[PDB]
Structure 1
Amino acid sequence: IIRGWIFGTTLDSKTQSLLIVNNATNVVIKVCEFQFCNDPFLDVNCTFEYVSFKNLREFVFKNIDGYFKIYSKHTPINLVRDLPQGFSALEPLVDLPIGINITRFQTLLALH
């Protein structure tokens, strides 16, 4: 249901913003001004571009020296709702030299 994220300062074409989307075939990334999805629902001059309850997806999103840095992990889980009390280390994914820096963010969701 969760397909990706939006990051930036204004998120509204006044300045550049970072768009990350999983389209089930691929992961696809851009930084752009325009808002194809202006609001976070998704149907069931860009300066950078890149491509690549039962399950828990974990991420750390981090932003340093104009790089955007991502770490992740997957596991199946059995706890009623919450993040399972325990420990397992997240691993680096990608490290993107996008030059944006971020004050505000949002997620993207698939809907009918």
Structure 2
Amino acid sequence: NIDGYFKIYSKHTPINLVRDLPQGFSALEPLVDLPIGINITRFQTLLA
């Protein structure tokens, strides 16, 4: 969240893993950038 622009980068890859983050290399492409102008200090994830 830089100068009020909220930037998101992301990647999807298919995997086959039990219980850890995989030892690999990937770059996140930018998908969206939203000029929201708000201060951010905390976050929380939303689960089903």
**Counterparts of 1:75 and 1:94, CA distance in 2:** 19
Runs of 5+ in structure 2 lacking a partner? Answer: none
Aligned length: 48
Bigger RCO of structures 1 and 2 (CA < 8 A, at least 6 apart) = 2
Q: Please report the RMSD computed on the Cα atoms of aligned residues, expressed in angstroms.
A: 1.0
SS at 1:69 equivalent: strand
Deviation readout 1:57-96 (Å, 9 max, x if unpaired): xxxxxx1011000000001112221111010111001111
TM-score, normalization: structure 2? 0.87
Q: Does 1:92 align with 2:25?
A: no
Measured against aligned partners, the alpha-carbon deviations of 1:22-79 in whole angstroms (never above 9, x if no partner) come to xxxxxxxxxxxxxxxxxxxxxxxxxxxxxxxxxxxxxxxxx10110000000011122
**Structure 1: where are the runs of 5+ without partners?**
1-62
Instruction: For 1:109 and 1:82, locate their aligned partners in 2 and report how far apart those are by CA, in whole Å.
Output: 19
Give the ranges of 4+ consecutive aligned residues of structure 1 lying more than 6 Å apart after TM superposition: none
1:104 corresponds to: 42
Structure 2 Cα separation of the partners of residues 89 and 70 of structure 1: 13
1:68 aligns with 2:6: yes
Percent sequence identity over matched residues?
100
CA distance in 2, matches of 1:81, 1:73: 19
- Say which SS state the counterpart of residue 105 (structure 1) adopts: coil
